[PDB]
Design a protein around this ligand. Structure first.
Ligand SMILES: O=S(=O)(c1cccc2cnccc12)N1CCCNCC1
Lengths: 20, 341
């Protein structure tokens, strides 16, 4: 399932802003 | 009728903002007035600490920025934007800046403290919000963006991490590191990968419409429990964003889907919030038909969820972080670059 793929992904924690 | 009262509200709100914008408050406290209790977060840049103001016994969230670290990351102009905008604004779902000041080493921004934590913690933990629960929060962002954009402000970092939940269960937007007062276009690559509009990814030169795209991401994340575009690495997220495909859970109502296709619209002439009717294309949408906008602004609507009050200075709703000492050098760093702070 999509939920299962997200929860096993490396981006379920707090996400940092990006920049140049 | 309705729209002329909104107009009147916003004209008065602009006069208020302009006075503070052209004449910013400055040096309104000192570090020694605050007792440092605990680090409760990290933002786009810097760290945020629970503190207690001695003279009142009020608790506050103080953001500390190392001026030398800010210069190296080329955030000088963005941090001046951030403090100048936040001291000037005033709206119920914007966190209030109470004091700002600086010393030889750091910049400080002391804000009202929300012990309930952010939407991120609560969303991840419960998995996903119901549609009514999601619309309650979305409505607050829609009005806040209505307020900010009327002042020529773009926000540029919407995500659950930046939305604090107050003791009434309403939102405060809590990080302005990328906020900017611009009429017309701007070009800086900034924001968070999952939330970036395609025009940002493609180095294209953009406006306020990227905030409405980010709203679509937020609503989707709140109602699905995951973001519309996700992968293990940012570049894989950017490909999905630019592709122009999006897939919705089978549980999304047909109205939600139709709101979201109009917010996550790659075509800027077709993206809701951007068109001739601006924000009213969103506010008058069917997904929002149940929403009473004045009752939301006034905080009369019953919140879906109210964080557990364990005290004025309780920190159990935030994670634990590494405690760095505040070191104030005996020499002034970066005086000229930050003189207006
Ligand atoms: O610690 S915070 O930075 C923070 C910033 C500004 C004001 C705050 C007020 N109360 C709590 C936390 C606050 N925060 C927690 C998650 C990280 N993103 C922003 C919200």
């Amino acid at each position: 399932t999509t939920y299962a793929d997200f929860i096993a992904s490396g981006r379920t924690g707090r996400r940092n802003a990006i920049h140049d | 009728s309705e729209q002329e009262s909104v107009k009147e509200f916003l004209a008065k709100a602009k006069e208020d903002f302009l006075k503070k914008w052209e004449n910013p408050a400055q040096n309104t406290a000192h570090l020694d007035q605050f007792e440092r209790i605990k680090t409760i977060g990290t933002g786009s840049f810097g760290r945020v600490m629970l503190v207690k103001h001695m003279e009142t016994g009020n608790h506050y969230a103080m953001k500390i920025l190392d001026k030398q670290k800010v210069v190296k990351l080329k955030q000088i102009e963005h941090t001046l934007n951030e403090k100048r905008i936040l001291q000037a604004v005033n709206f119920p779902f914007l966190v209030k800046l109470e004091f700002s000041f600086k010393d030889n080493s750091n910049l400080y921004m002391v804000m009202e403290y929300m012990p309930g934590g952010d939407m991120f913690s609560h969303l991840r933990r419960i998995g996903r919000f119901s549609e009514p629960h999601a619309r309650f929060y979305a409505a607050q962002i829609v009005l806040t963006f209505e307020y900010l954009h009327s002042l020529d402000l773009i926000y540029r970092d919407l995500k659950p991490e930046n939305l604090l939940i107050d003791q009434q269960g309403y939102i405060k937007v809590a990080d302005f590191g990328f906020a900017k007062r611009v009429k017309g276009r701007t070009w800086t690559l900034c924001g968070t990968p999952e939330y970036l509009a395609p025009e940002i990814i493609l180095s294209k030169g953009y406006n306020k419409a990227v905030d409405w795209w980010a709203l679509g991401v937020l609503i989707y994340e709140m109602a699905a429990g995951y973001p519309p575009f996700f992968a293990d690495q940012p570049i894989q997220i950017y490909e999905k964003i630019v592709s122009g495909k999006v897939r919705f859970p089978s549980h999304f109502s047909s109205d939600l889907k139709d709101l979201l296709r109009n917010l996550l619209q790659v075509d800027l002439t077709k993206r809701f919030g951007n068109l001739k009717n601006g924000v009213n294309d969103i506010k008058n949408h069917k997904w929002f038909a149940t929403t009473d906008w004045i009752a939301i602004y006034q905080r009369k609507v019953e919140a879906p969820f109210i964080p557990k009050f364990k005290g004025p200075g309780d920190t159990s709703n935030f994670d634990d972080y590494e405690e760095e000492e505040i070191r104030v050098s005996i020499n002034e760093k970066c005086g000229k670059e930050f003189s207006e702070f």
